[PDB]
Amino acid sequence: VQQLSLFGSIGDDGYDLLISTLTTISGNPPLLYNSLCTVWKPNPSYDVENVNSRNQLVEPNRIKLSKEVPFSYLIDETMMDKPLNFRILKSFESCSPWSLQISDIPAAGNNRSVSMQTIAETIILSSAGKNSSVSSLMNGLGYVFEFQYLTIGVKFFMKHGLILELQKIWQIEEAGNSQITSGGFLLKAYINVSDIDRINYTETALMNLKKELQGYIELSVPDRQSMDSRVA
Amino acid sequence: PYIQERLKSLNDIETQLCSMLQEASQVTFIFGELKRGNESVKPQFENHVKQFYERLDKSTTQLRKEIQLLDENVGTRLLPQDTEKMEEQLDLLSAILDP
Amino acid sequence: SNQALYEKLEQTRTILSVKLAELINMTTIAVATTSVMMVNNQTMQLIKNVQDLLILTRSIKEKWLLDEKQIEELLDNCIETFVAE
């Protein structure tokens, strides 16, 4: 899967203006959503030679499992009796079917227009047995829990497979939940492509989005080192 | 409405331009009277020219203030369905079943 | 785009007023015929300035321009009355 994304960032004041702008452009109201992502890193207690059976170098990469969870577990006591829409973000036995993914380093190339990234994905339906927990499954594969983050935001559905993710991200720990996007919202614009003509056409769609949004919000290209999940 | 009242204010500015034209025909005509050899039409002349530049100045203040409203209205109250048909068919259907 | 209306409109106002004073100061002083046509051209330029103000204000105006139970029962009696079962 080749995902082509362009990111951005806004403040806590222009949220209604960006929601109104993208609502007038896309012609559809935003859809509230959230997702929890847990990252499993290789076990430091175990030591394995980074080499395949064919005498080839192997680079260690983290494994990210993501799923969904209804808002009934997210809304507390002071959030009740409120409209279930986009205006909520301004007030901030077996195992579940997880989504196993591994993201690679984006492609090179100076003066690039988009940010193409190769990500492998398999769907974990369920499990059983003695150690049926997903944590014990990752420990059986050879990975331990490193960190996790829960993101809540809104998404749009335009044309040509474009997604605009205006979301906030929090770090779920025991000592407290720290907001990484404290002060604004994180913007995203990605397309999932399963050919050179379709890749260049996707880049044309992203360039048309950046040209259409030019003047308001700027959508630059993130650094490769900021999307590399390899363990060093 | 907002654009209705402000549109009426713009029409008032246009009527102030018309008044500027009245005072223009008055300064030129009564000025020609002053240049025929008469001095008794002097007070109404000076009053008509003073009202000329006064109405013009009010047009500048209200017009520039209006443009300031145009600058201060971008983003707020200015842009930079089958539901009504379904409800229409429901009310019409209820009108058929209940004459 | 409003600053172009500031500079342009203000320039039309200064040309209108100052050109009007130049007009009245030239009406009061083949030289005579050249005064006739200079005064007439100043007047027509004032008319074009007023019309310009009207066009610009028109551009400003153009800038100002630019439940389920009742359905289940309703369709229920509608179908029962329609088919006459």
Binding site: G8, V39, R62, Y149, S178, L186 | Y53 | -
Partner: peptide, 20 residues
């Protein structure tokens, strides 16, 4: 009479590595 928020690369770096 008249007069004439934050850093996108750092946030994404957190979403991919988890460093603050």
């Amino acid at each position: 009479k008249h007069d004439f928020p934050f850093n996108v690369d750092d946030v994404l770096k957190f979403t991919f590595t988890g460093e603050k």
